[PDB]
């Protein structure tokens, strides 16, 4: 749709023209900010492309599903549940990656107190993290249970 | 990898640490907030059971629930992770590199995703497939079996 188009005119950052520009540059050396418009575009691109590859997926077991005449409660539920899997997939394989140009751009040593920096707000973050988790999904089900077990009741109280 | 072995490397003296250990520390604490994550699933589902036994909700209903709710805290948990990871690379990545290395290193990443994207492609095909098939072919047999009363 149009203003889809539109938001995302109004909030592009970074142009492919550009990128290419700073990857071929005869500049001999790339200081961090270039690095990391170059890496938020190319995760963005990553992350689209891997959209399309989901989709394509559906697609074809759509034919699958027309077929045997699935139903959609069956269906969708088997989406959801490989979406999941192929995200883990795709964290792995990022991870790795993360881990690859980390070591291949930078020296074999880091300044101590850099990491432990790092790595209290790391644990901070996954502290945090989990405290909101508790509260919302506790409150998601909650509510979720009581009212099926409510709709349960009143069908019992009906017979 | 015990709990003392990180915590005597976190606290070491020396200056500066290298890949083995920043591998090793890290891989000791993904698994350490993989493992504190379950206990809060855990404690949900403990919640949850208190209604589930007030309004005797059938297990059938309860484990499907779960189940859903599961991945879908593990795939919060995991964008987590993503973010932190990506979060710990640019925080401890120097602020020059040669363009040269930068450039051969983006080209190894932009082919690992090429390769990762046609693989998931056909092996998430198959997957589904299999699955999808089976249980379509399941459904036709069962629908003869009731039509030929
Ligand atoms: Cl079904
Ligand atoms: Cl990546
Ligand atoms: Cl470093
Ligand atoms: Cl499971
Ligand atoms: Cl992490
Ligand atoms: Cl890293």
Redesign the pocket.
Known sequence: SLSDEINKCDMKKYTAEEINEMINSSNEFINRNDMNIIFSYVHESEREKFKKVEENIFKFIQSIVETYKIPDEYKMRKFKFAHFEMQGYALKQEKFL??Y??LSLNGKLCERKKFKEVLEYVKREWIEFRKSMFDVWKEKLASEFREHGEMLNQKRKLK
Do not use: D, Q, R, S
Request: hydrophobic share 75%; proline share 0%; net charge negative.
């Open positions: 993360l881990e140009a980390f």
